[PDB]
Amino acid sequence: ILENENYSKNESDELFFHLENKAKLTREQILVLTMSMKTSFKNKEPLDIKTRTQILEANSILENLWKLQE
Amino acid sequence: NGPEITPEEATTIFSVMVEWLESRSFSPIPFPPLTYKNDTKILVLALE
Amino acid sequence: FTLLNRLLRLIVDPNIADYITAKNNVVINFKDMSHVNKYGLIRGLKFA
Amino acid sequence: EKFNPFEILPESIELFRTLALISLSETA
Numbered sequence: 509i510l511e512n513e514n515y516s517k518n519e520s521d522e523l524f525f526h527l528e529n530k531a532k533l534t535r536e537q538i539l540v541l542t543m544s545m546k547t548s549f550k551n552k553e554p555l556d557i558k559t560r561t562q563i564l565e566a567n568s569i570l571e572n573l574w575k576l577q578e
Numbered sequence: 579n580g581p582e583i584t585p586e587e588a589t590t591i592f593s594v595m596v597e598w599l600e601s602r603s604f605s606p607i608p609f610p611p612l613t614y615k616n617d618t619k620i621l622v623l624a625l626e
Numbered sequence: 627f628t629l630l631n632r633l634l635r636l637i638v639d640p641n642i643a644d645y646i647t648a649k650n651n652v653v654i655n656f657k658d659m660s661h662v663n664k665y666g667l668i669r670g671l672k673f674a
Numbered sequence: 675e676k677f678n679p680f681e682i683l684p685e686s687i688e689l690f691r692t693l694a695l696i697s698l699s700e701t702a
Contacts, residue, residue: 536581538585563699605631606636606639609639
């Protein structure tokens with residue numbers, strides 16, 4: 509969700525709703541993502557294609573392994 | 579009902595402090611060191 | 627508190643912020659009655 | 675039972691091979 513270029517425009521409340529709906533969270537976790545998003549997270553440079561490919565490949569096999577364990 | 583702040587309001591609140599402390603060029607308070615000058619002078623004032 | 631631990635990590639190293647945040651839960655007892663303090667602040671604390 | 679233990683055989687050596695990964699081949 510956080511690397512998606514579509515939400516990255518700005519001033520989109522979509523973020524909080526795809527957090528709550530997509531990757532299950534509770535409000536106390538959304539607030540932490542907001543304030544830590546401000547302190548640490550940095551939108552100045554988007555990631556290189558290399559790390560995006562690697563990341564997607566990892567999310568794939570982690571999601572799939574979790575599905576198998578379930 | 580859980581917390582009443584909600585993320586969109588916590589955002590507006592947190593940016594204000596972030597910008598205030600960055601504009602003030604404020605260094606965060608560290609953790610008191612094992613070797614510290616004023617430890618004694620802080621204990622006294624505390625304990626009394 | 628979920629807002630306090632952040633606003634404090636701005637101003638202070640996290641170990642003191644966590645102490646200050648967890649120190650306010652405690653449990654509150656008056657004779658028979660007991661409740662854990664989730665929400666409000668306890669201003670009977672020296673750092674309050 | 676034999677086809678299933680065969681799939682199991684490739685699965686254990688596959689996973690133990692995956693624990694050695696410290697990647698496109700092992701990815702696919």
